[PDB]
Write a structure and sequence with these properties.
The structure is a homodimer. The first copy, chain A, is mainly alpha-helical. The first copy, chain A, is built from 4 helices and 2 strands. Chain A has a single domain, classed as Winged helix-like DNA-binding domain superfamily/Winged helix DNA-binding domain (Arc Repressor Mutant, subunit A). A two-stranded antiparallel sheet of chain A has the order 1-2. In chain A, helix 1 crosses helix 4. Chain A: Pfam families: RTP (PF02334).
Chain lengths: 107, 112
């Protein structure tokens, strides 16, 4: 039920960024979708509404984030979050390695 | 071949084409073979994935099947059928891979 299959759940990926935006205090439920799409327009990945907001609601659900004048998000359980980023760093490295293996193996 | 990150099936096929370039896409061993490449990187492909990939490459016509055998019988080896299309695909996937590697590089430097 965690963050893979093959490469890395797009929702893991997104969750990563949301934490990194929660530290930095810039995690506003406002133009969220717009920001995220703006972060990545260039490597041609356009995260859709549903995916962004499932990433977001899952983090409230795992008690990682909390809601607060629009809506801002702070850490409910920053501990769980801290460790969670460290789970992604490993996932992303594995992923980096796998692409590189493919690159070197096939070219 | 994509959308977020590269499709597992596309990824598999690329290997399959290279293995064919290396004159070693064998019928028999196959699934064991692949799972063996990617163990040690936490990717273990399943039967459906690998055979759907192999079968697409035939249906689309990149590969033809052959019979051959070496000592101790006949045995199945996969060969190119439209190697030019096989070549295109490798070029397509390069572009795709380079992107994924970029996307992961952004992630790593954006959050750590």
């Amino acid at each position: 039920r965690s963050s893979t299959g093959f490469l890395v759940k797009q929702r893991a990926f997104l969750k990563l960024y949301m934490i990194t935006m929660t530290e930095q205090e810039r995690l506003y439920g406002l133009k969220l979708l717009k920001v995220l799409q703006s972060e990545f327009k260039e490597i041609g990945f356009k995260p859709n509404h549903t995916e962004v907001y499932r990433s977001l609601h899952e983090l409230l659900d795992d008690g990682i984030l909390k809601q607060i004048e629009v809506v801002l998000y702070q850490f409910k359980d920053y501990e769980a979050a801290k460790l969670y980023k460290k789970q992604l760093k490993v996932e992303l490295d594995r992923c980096k390695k796998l692409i590189e293996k493919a690159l070197s193996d096939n070219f």
